[PDB]
Design a protein around this ligand. Structure first.
Ligand SMILES: N[C@H](CCC(=O)N[C@@H](CS)C(=O)NCC(=O)O)C(=O)O
Ligand SMILES: N[C@H](CCC(=O)N[C@@H](CS)C(=O)NCC(=O)O)C(=O)O
Ligand SMILES: [Zn+2]
Ligand SMILES: [Zn+2]
Lengths: 194, 196
């Protein structure tokens, strides 16, 4: 039906998704600085890796989408260059810590103890030299790519391309993640017990 | 002859036992609230568009229903006929001011007052409150995950989405991809990230 040639999503996925390695126990993320790079240790496997069309999250030069996962925050330690980091928006509910110099995002942190994703940092695992991280799993916030310059007419093709990558397009997060969010809201508000 | 057990799953009474089609040249009708005497009455003098079932916590739902059924109409086609003093706005700070009957609780239209909002010009109405058949029929389900926020148990979700699909109402945890892409375009052009 619809032609997918020359449709690019993110470098990490344009040639097929790379599988997790069983028993992988993490690695090191480095910023794109030639000198004094920010180095972050992620000493666990990640989960919920996906491409993301949201406007707020870091993408490499060119890519229409972002690639991002989640790790337990107590498995995160900034090793070298901690003083070169700054928050992009100190008011966004997820707080993105970013290299002052090459502008690459090193983690996103949830400071607010009642937020659904508290205890979980957002990490771009492509920032790591090692393979074996949690495979990308879907596409999040597909339609918000329009909000960063993507022409509406190009979407039929991009949704088809992600589907053929086995990366199911959603205009929010995926169903299991959207339901966990809603359950947590419901338990806090009293709509559900516990 | 089925993978998911869908027995006993109710969605909304307007889709549970038959969905009524639109009819040709349907030009509108009257909505009324549930008060036994002197009910709010409102004219909707066009056919509606983008009818759907919705899980959002803020949408009116008949007693017992887990989903709302809500559609869209040009505001210039909408007029309050009777009971204007019985109506109140739920939350004047919401993007959509829901006007509602204070004695029966039924929402009679939802209006957008910000001129910059992507659905400015369009009122939201529950055409189940009409006694006439012929309105646009539901096309999809929106804010499906939201039903948990109104206390549906999360283990009920697999059977609820399968029942959606059997009815032809594809489930989305936001709105349909077309409507989602329209909102983003409206936003992109106002920020100037797209040419006007
Ligand atoms: N439409 C999105 C906003 C939707 C949204 O709530 N963003 C998600 C993913 S970026 C979020 O969890 N918020 C991040 C934040 O604001 O901290 C955009 O491009 O601005
Ligand atoms: N978790 C949902 C999210 C709220 C939401 O996304 N609202 C949607 C659907 S009701 C909207 O278009 N807002 C209308 C409004 O501003 O009242 C809820 O049930 O409250
Ligand atoms: Zn740097
Ligand atoms: Zn009433």
């Amino acid at each position: 039906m619809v032609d997918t040639s020359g449709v690019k999503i993110h470098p990490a996925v344009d040639n097929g998704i790379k599988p997790a390695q069983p028993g992988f126990a993490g690695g090191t993320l480095h910023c794109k600085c030639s000198t004094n790079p920010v180095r972050v240790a992620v000493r666990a496997q990640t989960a919920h890796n996906h491409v993301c069309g949201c406007t707020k999250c870091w993408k490499p030069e060119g890519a229409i989408f972002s690639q991002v996962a989640v790790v337990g925050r107590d498995a995160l330690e900034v090793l070298e260059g901690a003083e070169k980091l700054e928050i992009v928006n100190a008011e966004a509910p997820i707080q993105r810590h970013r290299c002052r110099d090459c502008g690459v995002h090193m983690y996103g942190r949830i400071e607010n103890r009642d937020h659904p994703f508290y205890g979980l940092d957002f990490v771009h695992t492509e920032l790591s030299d090692e393979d074996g991280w949690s495979a990308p799993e879907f596409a999040a916030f597909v339609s918000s790519i329009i909000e960063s310059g993507v022409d509406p007419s190009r979407m039929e093709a991009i949704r088809a391309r992600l589907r053929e990558l086995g990366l199911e397009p959603y205009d929010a997060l995926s169903p299991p993640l959207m339901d966990a969010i809603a359950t947590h809201i419901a338990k806090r508000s009293g709509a559900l017990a516990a």
